[PDB]
């Protein structure tokens, strides 16, 4: 609800001049895993992503409702794991993210590289 | 330590202890600093005082 | 109006597909009010939620 | 920014005489292992990248991210490549590649297998 707070201050534009017109996007699990045919194939919608989240420079928000379902949880094979995409990219400032977390399971970032804790704020 | 240098662990590494000044601090000052040493902190003795010191020196041995 | 025998019925199985039936899906879905859905469970068998689950226990009451 | 300092200072002019003209390759995970496809077509890939650049006379300079990310994803069997090549490009000198490691990790990139003791540094 608080990034729910970010989309009504975009509607009525009380947003500074650079960050008008953005549009939220929520990443729901019902098509992360649904669309795993093959290995490939799952990071190849996430290639038809990322490389329309660069050179779109348009309305881009991303949003994650909890990051323990993208680097936390899984098998290494099985789809999202510690070893997911963007880790180096990331980094650079040409991907907007937004993600929440309970800190209780919070600490299993700090425990699963020990890699990602200045990749996020 | 002292006299080695390569300490077996759960996960079978070496860890050289060379170059290193390990330094071996505790107090031992109560009962024996007592007011022989204190009353006369002024001056604390050329002459004297030294050899005062150093009998507590070699108790504290 | 949907009933469930056991919700601990529903944390089992749910292969083929890269994750549990329950576990993944109605995550959202049951955050919000959707579903007509009524559970019932053994108290000895409910502390897996509370315990070692941990997320659904404001989920259902 | 060491390393990608050295390209900033090809153009300064202090650099020696005989390491001059060379190019860095970054080198993103996602352009390894991303498009291989766990057959004899992931050979013919390997030899793209390592035996093509070898006898080749251009001007070449690697660089690696992490050693860690590539012990981590190509564990097909057939596929293998989880540190298995470039054994003697590690005592000889027509490749030039650069790799980065945190010492948390790289202190268990060695003692954990104790056979990478003496190539490395």
Redesign the interface.
């Known amino acids: 609800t608080i990034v729910e707070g970010l989309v009504y201050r975009i509607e009525k534009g009380d947003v500074p001049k650079e960050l008008q017109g953005y549009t939220v996007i929520s990443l729901?699990?019902?098509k992360f895993?649904?669309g795993?045919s093959y290995?490939?194939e799952f990071?190849t919608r996430m290639?038809n992503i990322i490389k329309e989240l660069k050179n779109k420079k348009n309305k881009i928000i991303l949003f994650v409702?909890e990051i323990h379902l993208l680097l936390g949880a899984g098998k290494?094979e099985?789809?999202t794991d510690a070893?997911n995409?963007l880790?180096?990219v990331l980094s650079k400032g040409e991907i907007k993210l937004i993600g929440a977390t309970t800190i209780?399971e919070y600490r299993k970032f700090i425990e699963s590289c020990?890699?990602f804790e200045r990749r996020f704020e | 330590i002292l006299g080695d240098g390569y300490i077996n662990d759960n996960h079978r590494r070496n860890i050289d202890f060379s170059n290193t000044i390990i330094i071996m601090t505790s107090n031992l000052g109560a009962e024996l600093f007592k007011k022989k040493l204190f009353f006369d902190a002024d001056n604390s003795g050329t002459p004297e005082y030294k050899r005062v010191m150093e009998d507590v020196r070699l108790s504290l041995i």
Chains 1, 4 share one sequence.
């Open positions: 729901n699990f019902r895993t649904s795993t290995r490939g990071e290639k409702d290494a099985g789809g070893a995409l880790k180096p209780a020990s890699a």
